[PDB]
Coordinates of C-alpha atoms in Angstrom, one line a residue:
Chain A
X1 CA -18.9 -7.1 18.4
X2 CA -22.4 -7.1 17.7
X3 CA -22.2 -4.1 16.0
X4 CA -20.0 -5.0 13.2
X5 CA -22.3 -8.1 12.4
X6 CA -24.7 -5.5 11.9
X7 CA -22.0 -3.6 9.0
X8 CA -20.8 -7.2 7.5
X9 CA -24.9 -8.3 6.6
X10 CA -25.4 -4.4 5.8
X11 CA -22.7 -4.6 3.0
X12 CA -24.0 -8.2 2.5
X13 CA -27.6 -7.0 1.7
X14 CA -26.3 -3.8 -0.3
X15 CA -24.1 -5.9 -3.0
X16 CA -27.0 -8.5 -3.1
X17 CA -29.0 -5.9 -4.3
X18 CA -26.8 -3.8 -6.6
X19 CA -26.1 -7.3 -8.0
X20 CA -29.6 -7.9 -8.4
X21 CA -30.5 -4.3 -10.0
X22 CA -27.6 -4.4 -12.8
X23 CA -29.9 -6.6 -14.9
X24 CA -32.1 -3.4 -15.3
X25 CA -29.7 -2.2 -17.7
X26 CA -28.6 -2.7 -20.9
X27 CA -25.3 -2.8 -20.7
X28 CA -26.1 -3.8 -17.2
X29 CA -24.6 -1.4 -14.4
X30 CA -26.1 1.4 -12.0
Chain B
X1 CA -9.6 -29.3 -23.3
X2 CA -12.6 -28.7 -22.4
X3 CA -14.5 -25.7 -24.0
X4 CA -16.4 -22.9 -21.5
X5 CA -18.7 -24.9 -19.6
X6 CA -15.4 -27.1 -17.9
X7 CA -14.4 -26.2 -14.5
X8 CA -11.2 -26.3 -15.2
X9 CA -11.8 -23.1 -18.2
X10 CA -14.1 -21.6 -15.5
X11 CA -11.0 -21.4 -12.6
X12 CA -8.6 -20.6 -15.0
X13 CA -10.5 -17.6 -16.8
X14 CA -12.0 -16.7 -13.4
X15 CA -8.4 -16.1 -12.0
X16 CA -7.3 -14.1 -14.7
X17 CA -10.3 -11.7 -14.8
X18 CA -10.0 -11.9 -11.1
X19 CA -6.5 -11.0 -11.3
X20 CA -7.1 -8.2 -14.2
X21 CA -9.5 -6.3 -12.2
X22 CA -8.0 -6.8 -8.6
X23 CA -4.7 -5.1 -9.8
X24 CA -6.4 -2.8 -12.1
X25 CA -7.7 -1.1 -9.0
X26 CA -5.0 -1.6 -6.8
X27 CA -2.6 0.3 -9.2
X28 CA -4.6 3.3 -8.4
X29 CA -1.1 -5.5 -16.2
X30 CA -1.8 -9.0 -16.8
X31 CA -1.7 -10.8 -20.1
X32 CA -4.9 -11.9 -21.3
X33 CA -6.6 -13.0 -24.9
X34 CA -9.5 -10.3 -26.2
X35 CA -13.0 -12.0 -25.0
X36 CA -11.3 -11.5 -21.6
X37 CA -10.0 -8.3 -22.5
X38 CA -14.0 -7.5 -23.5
X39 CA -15.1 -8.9 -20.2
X40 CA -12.2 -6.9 -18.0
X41 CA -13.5 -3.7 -19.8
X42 CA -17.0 -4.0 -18.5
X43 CA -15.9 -5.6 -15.0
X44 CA -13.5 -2.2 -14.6
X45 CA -16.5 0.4 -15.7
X46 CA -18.8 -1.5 -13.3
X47 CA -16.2 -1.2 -10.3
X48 CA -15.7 2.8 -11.4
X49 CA -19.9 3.0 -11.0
X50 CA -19.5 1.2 -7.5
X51 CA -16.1 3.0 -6.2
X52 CA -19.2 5.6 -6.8
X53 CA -21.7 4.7 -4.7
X54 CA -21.1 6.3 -1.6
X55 CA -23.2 4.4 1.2
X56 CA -21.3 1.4 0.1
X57 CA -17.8 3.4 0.7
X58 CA -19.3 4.5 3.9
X59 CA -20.2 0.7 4.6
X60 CA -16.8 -0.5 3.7
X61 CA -14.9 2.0 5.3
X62 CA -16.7 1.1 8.4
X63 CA -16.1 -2.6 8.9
X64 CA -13.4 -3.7 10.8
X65 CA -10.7 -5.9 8.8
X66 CA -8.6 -7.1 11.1
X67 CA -9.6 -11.0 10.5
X68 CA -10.3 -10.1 7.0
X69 CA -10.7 -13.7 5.9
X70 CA -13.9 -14.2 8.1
X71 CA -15.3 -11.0 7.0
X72 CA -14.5 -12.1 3.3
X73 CA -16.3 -15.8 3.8
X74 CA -18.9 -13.9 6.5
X75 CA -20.4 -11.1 3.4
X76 CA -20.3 -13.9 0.7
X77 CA -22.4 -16.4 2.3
X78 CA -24.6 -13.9 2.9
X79 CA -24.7 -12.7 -0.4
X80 CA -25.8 -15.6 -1.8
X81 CA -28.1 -17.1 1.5
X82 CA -30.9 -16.7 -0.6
X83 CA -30.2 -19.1 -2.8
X84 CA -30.4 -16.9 -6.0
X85 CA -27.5 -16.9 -8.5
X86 CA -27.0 -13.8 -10.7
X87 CA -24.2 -12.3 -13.0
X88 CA -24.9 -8.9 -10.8
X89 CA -23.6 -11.0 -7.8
X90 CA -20.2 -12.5 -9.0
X91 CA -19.8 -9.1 -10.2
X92 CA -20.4 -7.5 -6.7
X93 CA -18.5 -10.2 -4.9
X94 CA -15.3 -9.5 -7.3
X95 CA -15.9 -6.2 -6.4
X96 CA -15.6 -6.7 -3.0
X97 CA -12.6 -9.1 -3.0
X98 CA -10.5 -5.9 -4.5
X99 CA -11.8 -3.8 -1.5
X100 CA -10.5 -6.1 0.7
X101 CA -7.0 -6.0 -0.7
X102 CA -7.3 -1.8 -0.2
X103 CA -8.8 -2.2 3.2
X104 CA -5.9 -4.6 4.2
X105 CA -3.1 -2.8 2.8
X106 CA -4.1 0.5 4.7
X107 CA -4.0 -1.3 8.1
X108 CA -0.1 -2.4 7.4
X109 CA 0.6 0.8 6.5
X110 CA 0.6 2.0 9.9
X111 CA 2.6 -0.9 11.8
X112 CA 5.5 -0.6 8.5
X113 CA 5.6 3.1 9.3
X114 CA 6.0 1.9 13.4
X115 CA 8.6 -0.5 12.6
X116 CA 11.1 1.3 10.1
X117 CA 10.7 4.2 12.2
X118 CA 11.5 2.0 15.2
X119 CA 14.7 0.9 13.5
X120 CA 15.3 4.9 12.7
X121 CA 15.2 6.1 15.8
X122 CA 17.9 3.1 17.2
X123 CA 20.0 4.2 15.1
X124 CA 19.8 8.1 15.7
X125 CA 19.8 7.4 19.3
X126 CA 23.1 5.2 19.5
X127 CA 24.6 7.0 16.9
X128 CA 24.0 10.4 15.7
X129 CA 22.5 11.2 19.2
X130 CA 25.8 12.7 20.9
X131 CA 26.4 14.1 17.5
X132 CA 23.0 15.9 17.5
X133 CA 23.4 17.4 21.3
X134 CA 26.8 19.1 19.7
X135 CA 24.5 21.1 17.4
X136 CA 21.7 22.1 20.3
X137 CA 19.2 19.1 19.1
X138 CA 16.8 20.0 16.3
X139 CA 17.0 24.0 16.6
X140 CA 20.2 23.1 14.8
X141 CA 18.8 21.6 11.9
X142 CA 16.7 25.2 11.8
X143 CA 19.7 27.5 11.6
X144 CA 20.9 24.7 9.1
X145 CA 18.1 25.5 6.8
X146 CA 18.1 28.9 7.1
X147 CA 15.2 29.6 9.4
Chain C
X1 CA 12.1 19.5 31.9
X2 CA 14.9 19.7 29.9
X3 CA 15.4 21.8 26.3
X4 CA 16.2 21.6 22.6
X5 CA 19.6 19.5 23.9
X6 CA 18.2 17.0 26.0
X7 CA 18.3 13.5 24.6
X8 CA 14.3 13.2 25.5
X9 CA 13.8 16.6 23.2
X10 CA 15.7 15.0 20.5
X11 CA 14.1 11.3 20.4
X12 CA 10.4 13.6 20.6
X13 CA 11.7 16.0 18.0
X14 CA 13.0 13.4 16.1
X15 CA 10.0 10.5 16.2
X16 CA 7.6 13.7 15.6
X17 CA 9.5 14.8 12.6
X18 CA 10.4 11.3 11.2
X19 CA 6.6 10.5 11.1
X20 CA 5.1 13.2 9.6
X21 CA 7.8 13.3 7.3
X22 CA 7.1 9.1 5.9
X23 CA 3.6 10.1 6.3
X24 CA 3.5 12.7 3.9
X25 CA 5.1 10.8 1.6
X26 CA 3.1 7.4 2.4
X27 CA -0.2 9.7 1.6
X28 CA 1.2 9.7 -1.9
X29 CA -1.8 13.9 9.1
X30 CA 0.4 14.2 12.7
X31 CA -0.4 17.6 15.1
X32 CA 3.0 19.5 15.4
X33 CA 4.1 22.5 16.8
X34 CA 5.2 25.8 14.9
X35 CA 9.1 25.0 14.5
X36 CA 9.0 21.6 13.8
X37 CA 6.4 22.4 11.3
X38 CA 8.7 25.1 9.5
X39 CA 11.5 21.9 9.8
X40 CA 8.9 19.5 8.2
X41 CA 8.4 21.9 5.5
X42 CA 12.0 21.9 4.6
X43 CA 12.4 18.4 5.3
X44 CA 9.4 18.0 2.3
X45 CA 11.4 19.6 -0.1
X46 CA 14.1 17.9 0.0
X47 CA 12.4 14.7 -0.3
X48 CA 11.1 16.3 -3.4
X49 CA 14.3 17.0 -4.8
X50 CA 15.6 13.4 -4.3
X51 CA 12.6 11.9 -6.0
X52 CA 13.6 13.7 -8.9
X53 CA 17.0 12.5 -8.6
X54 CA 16.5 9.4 -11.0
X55 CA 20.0 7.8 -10.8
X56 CA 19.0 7.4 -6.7
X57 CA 15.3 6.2 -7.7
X58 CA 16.5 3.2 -9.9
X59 CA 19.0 2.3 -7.3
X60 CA 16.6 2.0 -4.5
X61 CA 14.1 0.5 -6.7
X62 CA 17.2 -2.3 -7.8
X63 CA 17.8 -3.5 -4.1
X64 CA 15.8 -6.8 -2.8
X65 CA 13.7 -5.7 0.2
X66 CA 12.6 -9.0 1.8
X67 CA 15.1 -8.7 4.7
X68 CA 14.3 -5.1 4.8
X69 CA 15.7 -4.7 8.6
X70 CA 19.0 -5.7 7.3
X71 CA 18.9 -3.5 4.7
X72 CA 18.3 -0.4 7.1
X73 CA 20.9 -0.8 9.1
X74 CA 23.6 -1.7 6.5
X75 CA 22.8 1.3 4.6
X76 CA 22.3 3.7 7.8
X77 CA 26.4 2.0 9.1
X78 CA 27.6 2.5 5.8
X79 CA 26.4 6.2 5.3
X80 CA 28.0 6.9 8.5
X81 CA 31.3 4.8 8.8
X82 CA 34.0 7.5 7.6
X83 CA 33.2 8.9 11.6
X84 CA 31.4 12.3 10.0
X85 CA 28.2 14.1 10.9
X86 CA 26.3 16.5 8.9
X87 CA 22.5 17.6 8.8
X88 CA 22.3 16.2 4.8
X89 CA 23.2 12.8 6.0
X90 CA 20.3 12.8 8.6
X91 CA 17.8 14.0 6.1
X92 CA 19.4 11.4 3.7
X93 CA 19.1 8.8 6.3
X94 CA 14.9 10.0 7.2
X95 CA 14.2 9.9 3.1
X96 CA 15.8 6.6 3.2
X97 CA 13.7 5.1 5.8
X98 CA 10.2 6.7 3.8
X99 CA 11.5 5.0 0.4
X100 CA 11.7 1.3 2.6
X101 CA 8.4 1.9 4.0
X102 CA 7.1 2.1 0.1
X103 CA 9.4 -0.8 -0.9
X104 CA 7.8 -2.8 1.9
X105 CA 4.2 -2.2 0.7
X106 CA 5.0 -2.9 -2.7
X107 CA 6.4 -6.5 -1.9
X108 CA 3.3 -7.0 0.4
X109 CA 0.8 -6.5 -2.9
X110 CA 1.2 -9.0 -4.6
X111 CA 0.9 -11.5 -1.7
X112 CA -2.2 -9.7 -0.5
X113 CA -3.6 -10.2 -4.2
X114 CA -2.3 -13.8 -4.0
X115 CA -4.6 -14.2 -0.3
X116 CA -7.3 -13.1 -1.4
X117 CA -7.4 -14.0 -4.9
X118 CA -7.2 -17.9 -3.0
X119 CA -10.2 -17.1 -0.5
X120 CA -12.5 -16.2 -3.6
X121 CA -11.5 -18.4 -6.2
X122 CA -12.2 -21.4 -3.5
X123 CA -15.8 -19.9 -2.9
X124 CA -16.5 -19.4 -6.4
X125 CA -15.2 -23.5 -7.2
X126 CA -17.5 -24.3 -4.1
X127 CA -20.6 -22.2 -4.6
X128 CA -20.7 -20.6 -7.5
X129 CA -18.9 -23.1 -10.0
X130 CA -22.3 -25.0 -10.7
X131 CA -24.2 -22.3 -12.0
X132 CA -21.7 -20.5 -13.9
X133 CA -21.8 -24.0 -15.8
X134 CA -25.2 -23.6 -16.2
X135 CA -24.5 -20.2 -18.1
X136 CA -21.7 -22.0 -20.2
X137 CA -19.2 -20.8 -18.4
X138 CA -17.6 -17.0 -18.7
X139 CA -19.0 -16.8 -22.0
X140 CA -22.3 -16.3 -20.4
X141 CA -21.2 -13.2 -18.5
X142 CA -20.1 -11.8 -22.1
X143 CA -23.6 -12.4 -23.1
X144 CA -25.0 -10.7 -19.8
X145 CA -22.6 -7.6 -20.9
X146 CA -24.3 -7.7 -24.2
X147 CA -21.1 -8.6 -26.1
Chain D
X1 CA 24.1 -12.1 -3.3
X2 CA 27.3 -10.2 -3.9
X3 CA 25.7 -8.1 -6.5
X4 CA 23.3 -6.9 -3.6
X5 CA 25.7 -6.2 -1.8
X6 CA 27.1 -4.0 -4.4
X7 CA 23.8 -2.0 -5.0
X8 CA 23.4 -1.6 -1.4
X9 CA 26.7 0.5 -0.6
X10 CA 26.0 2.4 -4.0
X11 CA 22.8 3.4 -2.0
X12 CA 24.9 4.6 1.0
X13 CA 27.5 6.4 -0.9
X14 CA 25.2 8.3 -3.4
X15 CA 22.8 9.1 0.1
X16 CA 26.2 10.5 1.8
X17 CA 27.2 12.4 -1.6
X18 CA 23.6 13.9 -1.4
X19 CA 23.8 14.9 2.4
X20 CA 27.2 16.4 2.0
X21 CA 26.4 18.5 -0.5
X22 CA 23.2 19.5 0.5
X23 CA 26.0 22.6 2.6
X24 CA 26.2 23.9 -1.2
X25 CA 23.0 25.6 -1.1
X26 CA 21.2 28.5 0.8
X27 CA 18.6 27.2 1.2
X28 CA 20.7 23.6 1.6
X29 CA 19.1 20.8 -1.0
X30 CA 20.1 19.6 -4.4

């Protein structure tokens, strides 16, 4: 359904962007 | 032999730290030389500070994995459709690959538990069936244990 | 309508029973009524005490589970072929069915690991392999981790 | 194999040994 694309790019987006943000560490991380 | 940089050193290091960290987490050991011991020691504290983050549980828990394959291929062209390249990512994809595995497992659990039970109840009915009816059905297993 | 006797009462009963009982021990929750919850509870017990019964442990954990159907029903025939009946042989014959169901997982693991492991080491080769040669290779995550 | 089949009606016997003396005990178990 239409509404699970919606959860697949969600979870897409959100490890994009934790992957993104664990350069602001040193050791990288959250 | 190629040094680092070879593809071939690339699949076969990125198969054992996949490897390491995939079964670390499903446990919940794979032999391996110590700069990939260092890098499976940072991979495994970095999946601990995700298995923390609770939207992207929620998120996980949510999607349906039934054709896991296309969800696996679907999230990591999307997570690199920008174009962009980061260590963060290949981190957060390896990350997701071991969810997968979890997610997957948990929907065969039901259908084993349907199956052997299936097979169970055969055999009680054509066998221990007429044998049970002797005893008054289950209330005999009560007065059995003592209740 | 029939009671506690009825062969309908006893496949209910026993499916009810049966499931929460591998449940449990898969969890390691199924709505019942007041007496088969007092059975369940003994029926947990029991289990418990035969997972502490080690010599039985490394004997299941010895036997090849990859025709596990087979397995089941030579087992289940072979518990029952001197023609007796008893209540300890049917709880026997229930834990039995909850230790396959944990045998069956356990084979499926690895070949979920295997899956999976394939779909994301042939995305990484195909996407991913150029810039990781760009960092050197997996040397350049140890450098990210600031190793 | 042969040596299966071995380990499998060890399993049976020990699981009817366990269920036959389970009688011994009020409350029945091990």
């Amino acid at each position: 359904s239409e509404s699970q694309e919606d959860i697949i790019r969600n979870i897409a987006r959100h490890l994009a962007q934790v992957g993104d943000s664990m350069d602001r560490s040193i050791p990288p991380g959250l | 032999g190629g040094g680092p940089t070879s593809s071939e050193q690339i699949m076969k290091t990125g198969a054992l730290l996949l490897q390491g960290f995939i079964q670390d987490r499903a446990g919940r050991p794979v032999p391996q030389d110590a700069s990939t011991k260092k890098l499976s020691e940072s991979l495994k504290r970095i999946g601990d500070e995700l298995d923390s983050n609770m939207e992207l549980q929620r998120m996980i828990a949510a999607v349906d994995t039934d054709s896991p394959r296309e969800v696996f291929f679907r999230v990591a062209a999307d997570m690199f459709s920008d174009g962009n390249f980061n260590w963060g990512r290949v981190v957060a994809l390896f990350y997701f690959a071991s969810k997968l595995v979890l997610k997957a497992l948990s929907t065969k659990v039901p259908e084993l538990i349907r199956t052997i039970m299936g097979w169970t109840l055969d055999f009680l009915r054509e066998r221990l069936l007429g044998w049970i009816q002797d005893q008054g059905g289950w209330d005999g297993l009560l007065s059995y244990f003592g209740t």
